[PDB]
Design a protein around this ligand. Structure first.
Ligand SMILES: */C(C)=C\C(=O)N[C@H]1CCCN(c2c(F)cc(C(N)=O)c3[nH]c(C)c(C)c23)C1
Length: 260
């Protein structure tokens, strides 16, 4: 069994529907009458192990599972503001650049933790992060949580590939490494500073792969200072070994926060 991880479904309440998709319905509810939760109802062992062994303040946390019945429930921490991509696109937030840098640091801390555990995420992107009521960004879409947010890469059986978040060696040779997560992180910083624009927005995926191969890089968003742009651009070195680590990126981000 899952021991302390197995939740009694009698302890869950269902308050509001958050979304309906390929892997089932997600509801907001309460657990044990006091904890706000997201409850996924699956329309497993391997993906469960991933979430039961990774824990960080900037990763969306698994609280437990209901597997003694069908359909299965996956219970996680509640992130009231939904995905980071839609949060960035909501122009009423009128974000200050200080807020945008804090979102970058939240994700960088999660990634530094993942890299310290030798875990490769493989689909880092603003659509795969969630935002809580306090505006804190947390990385999701790993293990069981891929099914929670009805991930299009997972639901399409790998057909919808994240071309726009991939380095040249992934596109050409399927060479995944810590350095392909570093590249995706720089694209995520670009999504944040662009207020959620699609990277390479006027190109198709095929054109993007061709231009990347030719050395095209995303332009500096107007909200990004030259120092912030240097950080995201460092993620896109043609040579994977010349890209920084997440520990280095975190130190760069803190230095900018201290300077600005
Ligand atoms: C962004 C580009 C997409 C997006 O928000 N997709 C939804 C799809 C339905 C389920 N969603 C979801 C979720 F999986 C988990 C949580 C949570 N841990 O609180 C969640 N909160 C909200 C407000 C939503 C919509 C959530 C993601």
């Amino acid at each position: 069994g899952y021991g302390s991880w197995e939740i009694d479904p009698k302890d869950l309440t269902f308050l509001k529907e958050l979304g309906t998709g390929q892997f089932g319905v997600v509801k907001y509810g309460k657990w044990r009458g006091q904890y706000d939760v997201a409850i996924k109802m699956i329309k497993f062992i391997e993906e469960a192990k991933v979430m039961m062994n990774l824990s960080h303040e900037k990763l969306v946390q698994l609280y437990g599972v209901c597997t003694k019945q069908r359909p299965i429930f996956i219970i996680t921490e509640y992130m009231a503001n939904g995905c980071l991509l839609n949060y960035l696109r909501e122009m009423r937030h009128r974000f200050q650049t200080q807020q945008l840098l804090e979102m970058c640091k939240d994700v960088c801390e999660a990634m530094e933790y993942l890299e310290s555990k030798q875990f490769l995420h493989r689909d880092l992107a603003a659509r795969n992060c969630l935002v809580n009521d306090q505006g804190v960004v947390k990385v999701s879409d790993f293990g069981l949580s891929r099914y929670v947010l009805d991930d299009e890469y997972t639901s399409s059986v790998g057909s919808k590939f994240p071309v726009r978040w991939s380095p040249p060696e992934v596109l050409m040779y399927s060479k995944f490494s810590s350095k392909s997560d570093i590249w995706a992180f720089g694209v995520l910083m670009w999504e944040i500073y662009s207020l959620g624009k699609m990277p390479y927005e006027r190109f198709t995926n095929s054109e993007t792969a061709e231009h990347i191969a030719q050395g095209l890089r995303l332009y500096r968003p107007h909200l990004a200072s030259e120092k912030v742009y240097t950080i995201m651009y460092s993620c896109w070195h043609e040579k994977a070994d010349e890209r920084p680590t997440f520990k280095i990126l975190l130190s760069n981000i803190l230095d900018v926060m201290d300077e600005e």
